[PDB]
Coordinates of C-alpha atoms and ligand atoms in Angstrom, one line a residue:
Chain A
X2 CA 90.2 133.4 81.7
X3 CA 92.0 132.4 85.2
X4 CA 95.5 133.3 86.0
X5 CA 97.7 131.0 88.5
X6 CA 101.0 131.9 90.4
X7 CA 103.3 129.1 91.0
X8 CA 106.8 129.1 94.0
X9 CA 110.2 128.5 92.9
X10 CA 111.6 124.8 93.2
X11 CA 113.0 125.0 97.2
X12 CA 116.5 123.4 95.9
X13 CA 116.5 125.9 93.3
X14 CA 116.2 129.0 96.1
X15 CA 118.5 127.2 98.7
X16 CA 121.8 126.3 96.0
X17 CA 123.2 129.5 94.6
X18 CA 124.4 127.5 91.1
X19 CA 121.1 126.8 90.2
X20 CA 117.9 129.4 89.1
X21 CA 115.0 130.0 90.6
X22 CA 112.0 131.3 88.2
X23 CA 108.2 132.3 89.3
X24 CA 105.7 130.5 87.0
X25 CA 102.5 132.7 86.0
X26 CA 100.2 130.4 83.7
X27 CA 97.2 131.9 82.0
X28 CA 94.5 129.1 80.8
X29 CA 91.3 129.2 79.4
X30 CA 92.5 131.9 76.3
X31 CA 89.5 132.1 73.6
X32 CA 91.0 131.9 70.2
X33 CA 88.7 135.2 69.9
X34 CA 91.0 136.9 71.9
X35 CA 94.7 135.7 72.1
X36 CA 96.3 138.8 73.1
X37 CA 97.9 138.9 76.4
X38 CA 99.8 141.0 78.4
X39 CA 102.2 140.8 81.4
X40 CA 103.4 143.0 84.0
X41 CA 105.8 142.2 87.0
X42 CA 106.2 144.2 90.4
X43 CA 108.9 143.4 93.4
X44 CA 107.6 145.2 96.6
X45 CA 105.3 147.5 93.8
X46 CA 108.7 148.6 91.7
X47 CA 108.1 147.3 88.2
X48 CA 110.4 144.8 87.0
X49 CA 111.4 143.4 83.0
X50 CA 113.3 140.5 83.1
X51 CA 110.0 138.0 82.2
X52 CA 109.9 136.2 79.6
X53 CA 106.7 134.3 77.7
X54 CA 107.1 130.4 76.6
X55 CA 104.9 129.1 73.7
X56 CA 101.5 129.0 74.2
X57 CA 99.9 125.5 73.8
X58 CA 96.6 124.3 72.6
X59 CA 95.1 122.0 74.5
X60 CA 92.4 119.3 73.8
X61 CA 89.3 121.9 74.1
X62 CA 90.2 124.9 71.7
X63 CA 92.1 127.1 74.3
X64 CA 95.2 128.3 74.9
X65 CA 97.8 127.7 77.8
X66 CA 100.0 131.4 77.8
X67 CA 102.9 130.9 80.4
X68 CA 105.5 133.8 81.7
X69 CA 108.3 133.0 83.7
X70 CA 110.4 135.4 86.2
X71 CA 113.6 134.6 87.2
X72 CA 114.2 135.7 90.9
X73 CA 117.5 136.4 93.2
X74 CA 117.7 133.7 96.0
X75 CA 118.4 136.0 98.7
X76 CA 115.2 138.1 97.4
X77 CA 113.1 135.2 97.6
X78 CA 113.9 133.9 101.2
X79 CA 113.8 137.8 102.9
X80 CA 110.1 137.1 101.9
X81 CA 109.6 140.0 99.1
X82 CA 106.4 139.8 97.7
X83 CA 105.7 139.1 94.3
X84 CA 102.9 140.0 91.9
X85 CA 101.8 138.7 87.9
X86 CA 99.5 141.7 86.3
X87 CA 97.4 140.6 83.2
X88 CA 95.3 141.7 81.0
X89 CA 93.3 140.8 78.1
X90 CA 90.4 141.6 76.3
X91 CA 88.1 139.3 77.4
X92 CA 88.5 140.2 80.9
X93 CA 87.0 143.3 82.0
X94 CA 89.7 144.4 84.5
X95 CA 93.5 143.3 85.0
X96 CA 94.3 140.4 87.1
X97 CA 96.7 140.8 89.7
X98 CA 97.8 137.4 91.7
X99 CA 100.5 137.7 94.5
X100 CA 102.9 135.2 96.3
X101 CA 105.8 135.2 98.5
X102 CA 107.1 132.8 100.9
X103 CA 105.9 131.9 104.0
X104 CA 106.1 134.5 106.9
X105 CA 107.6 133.3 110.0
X106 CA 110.9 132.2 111.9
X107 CA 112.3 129.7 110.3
X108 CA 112.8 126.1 112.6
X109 CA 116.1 123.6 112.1
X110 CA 114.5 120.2 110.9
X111 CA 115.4 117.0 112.8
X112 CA 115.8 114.1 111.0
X113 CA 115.8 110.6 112.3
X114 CA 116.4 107.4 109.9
X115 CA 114.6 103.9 110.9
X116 CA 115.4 100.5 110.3
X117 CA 113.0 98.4 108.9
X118 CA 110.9 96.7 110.9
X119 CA 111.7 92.8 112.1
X120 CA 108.7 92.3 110.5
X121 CA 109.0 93.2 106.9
X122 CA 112.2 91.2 106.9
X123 CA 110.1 88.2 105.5
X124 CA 109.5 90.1 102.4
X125 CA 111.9 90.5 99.7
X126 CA 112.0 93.9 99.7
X127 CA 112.4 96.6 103.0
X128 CA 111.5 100.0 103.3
X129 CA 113.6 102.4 104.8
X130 CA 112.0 105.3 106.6
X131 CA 113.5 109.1 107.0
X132 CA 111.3 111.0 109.7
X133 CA 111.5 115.0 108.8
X134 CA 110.1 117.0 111.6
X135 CA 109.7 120.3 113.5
X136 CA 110.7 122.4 110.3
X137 CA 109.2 126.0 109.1
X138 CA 108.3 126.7 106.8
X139 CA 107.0 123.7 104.5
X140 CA 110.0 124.0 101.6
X141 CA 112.2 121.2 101.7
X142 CA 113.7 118.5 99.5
X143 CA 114.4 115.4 100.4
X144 CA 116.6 113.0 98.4
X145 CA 118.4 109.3 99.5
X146 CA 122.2 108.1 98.1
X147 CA 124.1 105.2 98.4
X148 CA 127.9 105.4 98.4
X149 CA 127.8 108.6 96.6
X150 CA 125.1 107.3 94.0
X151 CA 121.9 108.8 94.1
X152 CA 118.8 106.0 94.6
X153 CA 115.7 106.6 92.6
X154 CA 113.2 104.0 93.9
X155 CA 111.9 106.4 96.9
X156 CA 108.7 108.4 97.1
X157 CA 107.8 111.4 99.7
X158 CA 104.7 112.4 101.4
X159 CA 103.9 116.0 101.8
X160 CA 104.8 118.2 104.7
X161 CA 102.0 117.6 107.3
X162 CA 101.1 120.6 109.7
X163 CA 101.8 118.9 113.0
X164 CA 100.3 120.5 115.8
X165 CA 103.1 122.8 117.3
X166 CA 102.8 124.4 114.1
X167 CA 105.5 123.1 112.7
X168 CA 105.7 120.5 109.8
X169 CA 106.8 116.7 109.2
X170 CA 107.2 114.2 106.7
X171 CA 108.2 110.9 105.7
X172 CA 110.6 110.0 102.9
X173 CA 110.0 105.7 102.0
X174 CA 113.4 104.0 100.4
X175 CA 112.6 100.1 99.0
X176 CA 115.6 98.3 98.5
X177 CA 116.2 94.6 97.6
X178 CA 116.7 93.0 101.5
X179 CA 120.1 91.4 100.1
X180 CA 121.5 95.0 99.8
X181 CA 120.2 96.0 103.3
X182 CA 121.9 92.5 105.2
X183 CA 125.0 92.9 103.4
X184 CA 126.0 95.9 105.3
X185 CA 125.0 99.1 102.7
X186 CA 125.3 102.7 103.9
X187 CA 121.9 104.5 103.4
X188 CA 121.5 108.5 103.8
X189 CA 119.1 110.3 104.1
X190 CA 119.8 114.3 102.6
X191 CA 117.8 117.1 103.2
X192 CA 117.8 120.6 102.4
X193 CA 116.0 123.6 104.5
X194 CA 117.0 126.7 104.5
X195 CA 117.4 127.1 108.4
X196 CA 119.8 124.4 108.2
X197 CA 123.8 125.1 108.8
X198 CA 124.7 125.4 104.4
X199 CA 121.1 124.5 103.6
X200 CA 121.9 121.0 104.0
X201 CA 122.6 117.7 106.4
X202 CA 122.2 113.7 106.2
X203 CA 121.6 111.2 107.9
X204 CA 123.1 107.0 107.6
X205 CA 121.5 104.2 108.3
X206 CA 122.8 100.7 107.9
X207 CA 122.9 97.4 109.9
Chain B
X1 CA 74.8 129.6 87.3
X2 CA 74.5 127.2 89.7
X3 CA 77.0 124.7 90.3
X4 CA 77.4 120.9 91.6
X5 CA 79.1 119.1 93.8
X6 CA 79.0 115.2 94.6
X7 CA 80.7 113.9 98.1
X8 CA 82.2 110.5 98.8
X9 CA 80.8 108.3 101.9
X10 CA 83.1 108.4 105.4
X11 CA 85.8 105.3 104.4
X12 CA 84.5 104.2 108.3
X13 CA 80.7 104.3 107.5
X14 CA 81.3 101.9 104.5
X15 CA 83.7 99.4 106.4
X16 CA 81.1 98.8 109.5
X17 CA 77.5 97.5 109.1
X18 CA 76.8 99.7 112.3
X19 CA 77.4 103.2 110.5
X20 CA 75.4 104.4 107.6
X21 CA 77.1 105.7 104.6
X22 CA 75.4 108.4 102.5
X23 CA 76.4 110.6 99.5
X24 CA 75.7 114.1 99.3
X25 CA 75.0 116.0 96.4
X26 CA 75.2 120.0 97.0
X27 CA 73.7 122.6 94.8
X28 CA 75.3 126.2 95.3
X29 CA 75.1 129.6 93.7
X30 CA 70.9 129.5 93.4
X31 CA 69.4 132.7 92.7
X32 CA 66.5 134.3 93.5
X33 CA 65.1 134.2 89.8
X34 CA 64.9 130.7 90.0
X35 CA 65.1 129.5 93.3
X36 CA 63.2 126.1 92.7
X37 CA 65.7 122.6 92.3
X38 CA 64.6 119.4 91.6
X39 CA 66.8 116.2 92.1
X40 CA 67.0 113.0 90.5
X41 CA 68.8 110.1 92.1
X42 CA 70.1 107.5 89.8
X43 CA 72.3 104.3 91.4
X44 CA 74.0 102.0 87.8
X45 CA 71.5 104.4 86.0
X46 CA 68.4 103.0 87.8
X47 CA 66.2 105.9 89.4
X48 CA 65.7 105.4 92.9
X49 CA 63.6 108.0 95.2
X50 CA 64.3 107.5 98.9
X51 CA 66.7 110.4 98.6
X52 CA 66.2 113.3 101.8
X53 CA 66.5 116.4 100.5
X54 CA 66.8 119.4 102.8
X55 CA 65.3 123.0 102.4
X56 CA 67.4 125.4 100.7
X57 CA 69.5 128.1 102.1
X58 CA 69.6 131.7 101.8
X59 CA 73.8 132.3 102.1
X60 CA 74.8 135.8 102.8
X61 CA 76.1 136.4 99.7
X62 CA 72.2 136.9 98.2
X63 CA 72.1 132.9 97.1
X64 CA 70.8 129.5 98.1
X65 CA 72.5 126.2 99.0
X66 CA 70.3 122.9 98.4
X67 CA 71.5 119.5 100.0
X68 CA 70.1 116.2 98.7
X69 CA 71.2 113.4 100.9
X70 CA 70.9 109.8 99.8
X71 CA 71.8 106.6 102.2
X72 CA 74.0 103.6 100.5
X73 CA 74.3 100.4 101.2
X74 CA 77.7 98.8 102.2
X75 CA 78.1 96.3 99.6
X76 CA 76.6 98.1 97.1
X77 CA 79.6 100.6 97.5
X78 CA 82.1 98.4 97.9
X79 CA 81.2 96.3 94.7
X80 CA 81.8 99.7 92.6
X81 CA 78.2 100.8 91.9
X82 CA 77.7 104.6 89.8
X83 CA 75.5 107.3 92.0
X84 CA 74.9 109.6 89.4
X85 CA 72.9 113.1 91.0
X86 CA 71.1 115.1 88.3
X87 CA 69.8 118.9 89.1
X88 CA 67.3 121.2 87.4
X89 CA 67.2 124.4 87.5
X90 CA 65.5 127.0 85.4
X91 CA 68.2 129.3 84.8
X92 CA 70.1 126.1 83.5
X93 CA 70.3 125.2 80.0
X94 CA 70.8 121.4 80.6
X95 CA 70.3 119.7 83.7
X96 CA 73.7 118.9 85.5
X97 CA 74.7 115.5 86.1
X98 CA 77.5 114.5 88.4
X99 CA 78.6 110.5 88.9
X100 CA 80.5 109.6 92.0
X101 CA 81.5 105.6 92.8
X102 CA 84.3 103.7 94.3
X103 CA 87.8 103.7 92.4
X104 CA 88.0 101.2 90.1
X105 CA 90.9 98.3 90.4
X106 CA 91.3 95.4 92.5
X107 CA 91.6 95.6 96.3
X108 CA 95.0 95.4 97.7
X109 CA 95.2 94.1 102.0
X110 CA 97.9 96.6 103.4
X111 CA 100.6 95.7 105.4
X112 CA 101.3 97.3 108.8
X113 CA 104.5 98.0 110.8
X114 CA 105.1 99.5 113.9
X115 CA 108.1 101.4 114.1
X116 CA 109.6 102.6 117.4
X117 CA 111.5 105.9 118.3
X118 CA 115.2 106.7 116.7
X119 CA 117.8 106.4 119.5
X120 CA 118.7 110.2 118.9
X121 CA 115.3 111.3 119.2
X122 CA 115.6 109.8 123.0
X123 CA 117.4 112.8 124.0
X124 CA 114.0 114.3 123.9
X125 CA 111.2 115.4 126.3
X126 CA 108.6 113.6 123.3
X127 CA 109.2 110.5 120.9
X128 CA 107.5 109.8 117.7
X129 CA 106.0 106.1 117.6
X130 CA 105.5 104.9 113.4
X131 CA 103.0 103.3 111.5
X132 CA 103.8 102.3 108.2
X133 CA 101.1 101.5 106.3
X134 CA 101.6 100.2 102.9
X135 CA 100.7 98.4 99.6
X136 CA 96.8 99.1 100.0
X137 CA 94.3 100.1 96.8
X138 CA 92.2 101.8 97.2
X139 CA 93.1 104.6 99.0
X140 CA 90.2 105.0 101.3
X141 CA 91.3 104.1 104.9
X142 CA 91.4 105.1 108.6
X143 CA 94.3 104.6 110.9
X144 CA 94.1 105.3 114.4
X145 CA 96.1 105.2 117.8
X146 CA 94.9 103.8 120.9
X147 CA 97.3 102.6 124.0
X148 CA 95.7 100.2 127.6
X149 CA 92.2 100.5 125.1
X150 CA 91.8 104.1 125.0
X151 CA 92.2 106.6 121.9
X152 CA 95.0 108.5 121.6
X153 CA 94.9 112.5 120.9
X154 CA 98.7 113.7 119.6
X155 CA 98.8 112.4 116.5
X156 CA 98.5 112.8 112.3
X157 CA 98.5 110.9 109.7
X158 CA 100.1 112.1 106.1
X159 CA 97.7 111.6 102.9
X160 CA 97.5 108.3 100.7
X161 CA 100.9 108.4 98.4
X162 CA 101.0 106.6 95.1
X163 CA 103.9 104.3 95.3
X164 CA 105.9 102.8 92.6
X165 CA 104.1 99.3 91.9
X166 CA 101.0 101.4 91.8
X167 CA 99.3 100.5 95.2
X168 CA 99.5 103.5 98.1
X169 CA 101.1 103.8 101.2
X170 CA 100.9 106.1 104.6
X171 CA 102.5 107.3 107.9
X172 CA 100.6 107.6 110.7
X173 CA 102.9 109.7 113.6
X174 CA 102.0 109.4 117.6
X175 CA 104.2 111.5 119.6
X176 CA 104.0 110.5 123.3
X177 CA 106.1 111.8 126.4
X178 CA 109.0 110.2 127.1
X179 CA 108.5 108.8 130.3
X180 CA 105.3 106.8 129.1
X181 CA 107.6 105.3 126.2
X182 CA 110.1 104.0 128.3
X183 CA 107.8 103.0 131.2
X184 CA 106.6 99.9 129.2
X185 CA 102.8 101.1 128.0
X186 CA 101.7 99.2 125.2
X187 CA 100.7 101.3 122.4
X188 CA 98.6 99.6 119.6
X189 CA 97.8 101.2 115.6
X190 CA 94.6 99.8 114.1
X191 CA 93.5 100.1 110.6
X192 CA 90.3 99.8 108.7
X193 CA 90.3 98.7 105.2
X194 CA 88.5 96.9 102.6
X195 CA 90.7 94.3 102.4
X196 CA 91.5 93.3 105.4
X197 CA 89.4 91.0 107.0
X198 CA 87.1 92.0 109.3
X199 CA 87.9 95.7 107.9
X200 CA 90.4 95.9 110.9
X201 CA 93.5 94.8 111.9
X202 CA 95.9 95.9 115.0
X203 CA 99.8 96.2 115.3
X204 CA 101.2 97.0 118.7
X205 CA 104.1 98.5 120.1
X206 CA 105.7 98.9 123.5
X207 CA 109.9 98.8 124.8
Ligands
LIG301 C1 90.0 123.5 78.9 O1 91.4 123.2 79.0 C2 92.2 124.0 79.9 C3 93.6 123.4 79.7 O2 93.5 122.1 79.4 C4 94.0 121.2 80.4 O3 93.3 121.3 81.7 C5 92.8 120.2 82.4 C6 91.3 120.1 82.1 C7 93.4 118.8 82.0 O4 92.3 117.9 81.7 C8 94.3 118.8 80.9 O5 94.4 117.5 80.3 C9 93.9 119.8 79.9 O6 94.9 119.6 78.8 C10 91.6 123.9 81.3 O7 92.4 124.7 82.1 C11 92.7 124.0 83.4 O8 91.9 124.7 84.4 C12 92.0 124.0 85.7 C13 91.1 124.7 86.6 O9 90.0 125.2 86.0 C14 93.5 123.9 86.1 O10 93.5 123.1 87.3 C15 94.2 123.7 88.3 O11 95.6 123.3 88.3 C16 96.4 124.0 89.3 C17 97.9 123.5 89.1 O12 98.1 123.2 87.8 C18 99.4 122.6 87.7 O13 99.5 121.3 88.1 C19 98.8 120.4 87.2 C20 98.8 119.0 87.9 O14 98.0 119.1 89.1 C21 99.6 120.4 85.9 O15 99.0 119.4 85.0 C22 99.5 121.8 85.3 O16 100.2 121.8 84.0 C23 100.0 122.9 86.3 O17 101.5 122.8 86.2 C24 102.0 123.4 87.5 O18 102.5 124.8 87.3 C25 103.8 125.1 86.9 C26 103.9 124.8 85.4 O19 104.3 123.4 85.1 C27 104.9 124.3 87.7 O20 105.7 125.2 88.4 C28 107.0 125.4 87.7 O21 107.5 124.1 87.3 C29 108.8 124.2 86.6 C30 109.2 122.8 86.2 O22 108.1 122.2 85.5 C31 109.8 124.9 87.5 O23 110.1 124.1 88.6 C32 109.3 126.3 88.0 O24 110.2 126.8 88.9 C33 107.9 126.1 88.6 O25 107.5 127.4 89.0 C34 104.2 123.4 88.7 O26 105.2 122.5 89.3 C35 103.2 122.5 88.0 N1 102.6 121.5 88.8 C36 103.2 120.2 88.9 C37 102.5 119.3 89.9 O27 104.1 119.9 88.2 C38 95.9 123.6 90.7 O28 96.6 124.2 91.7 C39 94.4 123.9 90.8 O29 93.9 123.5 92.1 C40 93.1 124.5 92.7 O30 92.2 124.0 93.6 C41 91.3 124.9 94.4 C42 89.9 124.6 94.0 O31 89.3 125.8 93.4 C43 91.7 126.3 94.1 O32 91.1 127.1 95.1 C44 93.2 126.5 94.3 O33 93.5 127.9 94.0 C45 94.4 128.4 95.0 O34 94.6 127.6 96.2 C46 95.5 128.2 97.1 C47 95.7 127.2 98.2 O35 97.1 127.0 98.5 C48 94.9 129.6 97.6 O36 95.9 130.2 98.5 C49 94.6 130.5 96.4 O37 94.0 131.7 96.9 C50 93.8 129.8 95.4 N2 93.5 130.6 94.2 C51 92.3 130.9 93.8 C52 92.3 131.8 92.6 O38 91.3 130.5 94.4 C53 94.0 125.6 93.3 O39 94.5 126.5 92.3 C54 93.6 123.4 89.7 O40 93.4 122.0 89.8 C55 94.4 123.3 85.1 O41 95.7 123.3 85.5 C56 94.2 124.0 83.7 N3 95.0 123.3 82.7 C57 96.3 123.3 82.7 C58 97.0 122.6 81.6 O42 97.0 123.9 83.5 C59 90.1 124.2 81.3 O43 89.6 123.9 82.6 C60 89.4 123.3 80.3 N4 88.0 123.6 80.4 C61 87.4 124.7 80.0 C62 85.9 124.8 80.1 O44 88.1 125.7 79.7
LIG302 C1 78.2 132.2 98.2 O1 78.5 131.6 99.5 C2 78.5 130.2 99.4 C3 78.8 129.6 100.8 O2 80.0 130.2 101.3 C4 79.9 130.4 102.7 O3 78.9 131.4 103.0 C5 79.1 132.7 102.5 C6 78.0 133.6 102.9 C7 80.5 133.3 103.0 O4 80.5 133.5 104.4 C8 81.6 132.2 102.7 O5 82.8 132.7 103.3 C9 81.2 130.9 103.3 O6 82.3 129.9 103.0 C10 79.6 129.7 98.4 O7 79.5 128.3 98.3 C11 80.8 127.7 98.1 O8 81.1 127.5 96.8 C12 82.4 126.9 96.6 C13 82.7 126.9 95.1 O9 82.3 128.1 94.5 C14 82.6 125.6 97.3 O10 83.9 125.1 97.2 C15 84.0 123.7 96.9 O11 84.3 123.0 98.1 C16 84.5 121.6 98.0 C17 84.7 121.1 99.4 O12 83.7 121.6 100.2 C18 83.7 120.9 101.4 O13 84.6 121.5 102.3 C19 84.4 122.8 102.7 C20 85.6 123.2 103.7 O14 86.8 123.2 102.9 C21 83.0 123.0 103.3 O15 82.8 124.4 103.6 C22 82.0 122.5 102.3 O16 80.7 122.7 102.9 C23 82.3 121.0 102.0 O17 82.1 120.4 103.2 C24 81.9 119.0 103.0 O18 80.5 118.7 102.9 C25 80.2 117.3 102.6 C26 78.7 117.2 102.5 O19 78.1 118.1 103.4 C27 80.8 116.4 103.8 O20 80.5 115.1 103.6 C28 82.2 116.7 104.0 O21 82.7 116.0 105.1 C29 82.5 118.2 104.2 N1 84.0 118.4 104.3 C30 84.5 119.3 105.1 C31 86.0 119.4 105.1 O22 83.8 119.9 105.9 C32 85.8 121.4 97.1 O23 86.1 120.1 97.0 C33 85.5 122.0 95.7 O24 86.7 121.9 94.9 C34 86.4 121.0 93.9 O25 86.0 121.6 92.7 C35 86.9 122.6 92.3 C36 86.2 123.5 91.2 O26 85.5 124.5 91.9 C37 88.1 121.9 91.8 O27 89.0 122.9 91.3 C38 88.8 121.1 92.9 O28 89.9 120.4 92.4 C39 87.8 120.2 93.6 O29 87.6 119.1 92.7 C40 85.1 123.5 95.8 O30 86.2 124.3 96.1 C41 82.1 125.7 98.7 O31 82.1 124.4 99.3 C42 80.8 126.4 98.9 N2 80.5 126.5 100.3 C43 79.5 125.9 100.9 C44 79.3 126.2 102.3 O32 78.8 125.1 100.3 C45 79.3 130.3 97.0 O33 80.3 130.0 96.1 C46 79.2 131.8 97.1 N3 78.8 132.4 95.9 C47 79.5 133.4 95.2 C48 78.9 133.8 93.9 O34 80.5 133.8 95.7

């Protein structure tokens, strides 16, 4: 049996509205021994709000058990640590796993939107390029709109550790190059928590 | 018991005839009880014996690490034949087998586009230079900067990205000082593919 701790979404810490949870998933469970048990510490002070989803069987006679903590925003980003405690009979001592953010001071991204370039303007479609960089620590989203209407054909690379130990990225928009020579506003939104409300775009247009 | 593990060629030591590609099968967690490993080398399921294999190592954690290294030849990679490494032990069951090749699909050429600095970032001491790399399959590639035929040092390159027609795409980032930007110096990204001809192809830059 193997236990895994997974973060909170970053939009879910940075927006008050919505709710940040911390994922502990248990795989490998024998059908032998299906019993397990959780336990959830803040800073070592033992906590009860978890609760345990449905466990799934997968395609090699195990089980999948998952527990789910929701957690305070503000808790979250003042970097308190937290820690998932199982136990089961197969294992011969309790499991502890730990996580917490990122330690550090946190640095204002910069973003930078780029035309496309003269030579893609042969093809029928362009790319349009958001340049993320000199942000800590590596949580960010990074989403692109269009007159107020969100655009969904757009993909995201991961946050790269540059070398001034900061990170970058690059966020890829392809539109139809009709829309782009007809004069459409393009942004660019991002969301870090050492930003000014969490939050800042960028245009771009021709 | 012991465990296996099966590495790729260099994506530059399959694209040049000068370079020699090898695969590397690695055998960890050997103990003492049984510190004796025999390999088997098998290319499309064919045995083939002119495999180097290395003396084992005693780690520090009371186990031995065994190496088998076997050299590959360029087209045989790139036309998508198995390597399969099989290792027997005698604290094993079964013997292991692991199979490693190319990823399977047809070759896509990639298309490459110099992007120059934003116009806010010029307020800067440095300035980012862009190369977009894009609609490429497979994944295995190698970008790099050069500027007046010399490599560049300051910059990275983000991972392959699965796009949304299924082929991938990359950034490669070169930050320069100002003052070299704006001077005129020609900066140049090359790229090394399978699908391009030649494996390479260059896209410069300068103001
Ligand atoms: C029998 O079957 C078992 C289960 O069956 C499934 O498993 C596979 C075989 C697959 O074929 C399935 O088809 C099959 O059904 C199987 O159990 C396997 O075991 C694997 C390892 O043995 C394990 O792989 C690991 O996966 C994790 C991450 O897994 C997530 O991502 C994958 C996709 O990559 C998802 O498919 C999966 O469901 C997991 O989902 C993520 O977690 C949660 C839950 O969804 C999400 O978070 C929440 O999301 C919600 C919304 O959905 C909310 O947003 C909420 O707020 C969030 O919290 C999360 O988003 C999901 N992810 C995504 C992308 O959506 C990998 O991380 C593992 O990689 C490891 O790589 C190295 C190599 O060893 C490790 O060292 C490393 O460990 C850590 O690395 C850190 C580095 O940063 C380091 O600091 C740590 O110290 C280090 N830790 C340790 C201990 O060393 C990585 O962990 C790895 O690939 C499979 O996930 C698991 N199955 C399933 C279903 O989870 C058995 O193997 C199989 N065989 C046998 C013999 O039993
Ligand atoms: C006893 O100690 C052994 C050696 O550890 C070292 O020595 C001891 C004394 C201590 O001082 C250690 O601190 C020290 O590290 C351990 O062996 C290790 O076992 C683990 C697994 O148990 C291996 O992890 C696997 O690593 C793969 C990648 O490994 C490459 O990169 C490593 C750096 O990140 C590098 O150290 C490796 O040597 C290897 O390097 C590549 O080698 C090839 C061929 O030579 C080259 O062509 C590449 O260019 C090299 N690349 C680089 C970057 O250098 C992972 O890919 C692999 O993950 C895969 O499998 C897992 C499942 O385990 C999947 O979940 C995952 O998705 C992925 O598919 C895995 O993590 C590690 O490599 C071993 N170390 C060595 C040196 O071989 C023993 O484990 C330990 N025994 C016990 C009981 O503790």
């Amino acid at each position: 049996p193997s236990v895994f701790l997974f973060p909170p979404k970053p939009k879910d810490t940075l927006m008050i509205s919505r709710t940040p949870e911390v994922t502990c998933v248990v795989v490998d469970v024998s059908h032998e021994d299906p019993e397990v048990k959780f336990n959830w510490y803040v800073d070592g002070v033992e906590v009860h709000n978890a609760k345990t989803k449905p466990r799934e069987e997968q395609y090699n006679s195990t089980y999948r058990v998952v527990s789910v903590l929701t957690v305070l925003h503000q808790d979250w980003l003042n970097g308190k640590e937290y820690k998932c405690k199982v136990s089961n009979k197969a294992l011969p001592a309790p499991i502890e796993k730990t996580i917490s953010k990122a330690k550090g001071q946190p640095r204002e991204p910069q973003v930078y939107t780029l035309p496309p370039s003269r030579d893609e303007l042969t093809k029928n479609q362009v790319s349009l390029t958001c340049l993320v960089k000199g942000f800590y620590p590596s949580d960010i989203a990074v989403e692109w709109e269009s007159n107020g209407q969100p655009e969904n054909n757009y993909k995201t690379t991961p946050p790269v550790l540059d070398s001034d130990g900061s990170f970058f990225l690059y966020s890829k928009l392809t539109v139809d190059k009709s829309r782009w020579q007809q004069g459409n506003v393009f942004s660019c939104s991002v969301m870090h928590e050492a930003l000014h409300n969490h939050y800042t775009q960028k245009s771009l247009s021709l």
